[PDB]
A = this chain, B = another copy of it.
Amino acid sequence: WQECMDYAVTLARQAGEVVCEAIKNVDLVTATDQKVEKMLISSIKEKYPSHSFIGEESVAAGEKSILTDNPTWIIDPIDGTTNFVHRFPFVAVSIGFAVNKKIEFGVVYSCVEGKMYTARKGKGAFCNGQKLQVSQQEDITKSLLVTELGSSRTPETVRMVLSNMEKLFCIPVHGIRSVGTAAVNMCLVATGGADAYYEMGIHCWDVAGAGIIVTEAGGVLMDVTGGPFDLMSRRVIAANNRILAERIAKEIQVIPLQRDDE
């Protein structure tokens, strides 16, 4: 599996480059998205024809995101679309790989920054060859959180997204940031740059790569309820530690959402 991983890192860099080259300069973000997943999918089918793959293409072609025991690649060609369009500086290419339904490695590349985050189950997390360690803050009032406002303009939803932000802001927490991509937000928690990231409405391909980088940097992922993280539930709390994770968990309120499963 290390060859698979070391392959995936070259494939993340190359994809990274097509995204970056296109950021200098059917809209451009769609043209570049179609090119990079074709690049990414037929490069994994040629070298690994045995392996399965979950992504948005497979879901849109009617297949269900259900993870089996066979090597699956959970691919996100460009994480940070709106960003791409604005040249707002954070877009990531994401690749997560699972065997026996557990993620084995994750590779996230932040194009415009030139940063390559990798992690492998058991061997630790690194940003560009330097090891990552999450923070030690266990006090919620001194923690800095990252989250996003959603892609939904449905007012019942928007009011809850803002309602939950308010409750946490008033705890008080140190502050909240939004950088515009879920994969990069989780890498910021892996470095120690933020203390926790929560979001309800993401998709498994958005988080499968960076989830393992949070944990090999020493953090915890868990469900918005307090229960175990569930890759197909559309919701995540990636934190530096359980204390903080549970805190966030007890205060927010669920936004009903249809599992990636159903």
Chain A interface (Cβ within 8 Å of chain B)?
Answer: 82-83, 85-89, 135, 144, 149, 153, 155, 158-159, 162, 165-166, 169-170, 172, 174-180, 188, 191-195
* Residue of A149, A159, A192 with most partner-chain B CB within 10 A: A149
Residue in B89, B144, B155 whose CB lies within 8 Å of A170: B155
A149-B176, A175-B82, A178-B176 as given contacts; A88 in contact with B170, CB under 8 Å: no
A-B contact pairs, 13 of them (CB 8 A): A82-B144, A82-B175, A85-B144, A86-B195, A88-B144, A88-B193, A149-B165, A149-B176, A155-B170, A158-B166, A162-B162, A162-B165, A175-B180
Q: Let me know if B172 and A153 touch, CB within 8 A.
A: yes
A88-B177, A180-B175 as given contacts; A169 in contact with B153, CB under 8 Å: yes
* Residue of A82, A86, A89, A162 with most partner-chain B CB within 10 A: A86
A149-B176, A169-B153, A178-B177 as given contacts; A193 in contact with B144, CB under 8 Å: no
Q: Let me know if B178 and A153 touch, CB within 8 A.
A: no
Tell me the number of copies of this protein. 2
Q: Let me know if A158 and B162 touch, CB within 8 A.
A: no
**Given A86-B135, A86-B192, 6 extra CB contacts under 8 A:** A87-B191, A149-B165, A149-B176, A153-B169, A158-B166, A176-B178
Residues of B within 8 A of A135 (CB): 86
Q: Let me know if B162 and A149 touch, CB within 8 A.
A: no
Q: Let me know if B180 and A179 touch, CB within 8 A.
A: no
The distance in angstroms between the C-alpha atoms of A154 and B107, with both chains bound, is 41
The distance in angstroms between the C-alpha atoms of A180 and B86, with both chains bound, is 19
Q: Let me know if A193 and B149 touch, CB within 8 A.
A: no
Residue in B83, B149, B188, B194 whose CB lies within 8 Å of A169: B149
Residues of B within 8 A of A174 (CB): 82, 85-86
A155-B170, A170-B153, A180-B175 as given contacts; A193 in contact with B162, CB under 8 Å: no
A86 → B minimal CB distance (Å): 4
Residue in B86, B170, B179, B194 whose CB lies within 8 Å of A86: B194
Residues of B within 8 A of A178 (CB): 176-178
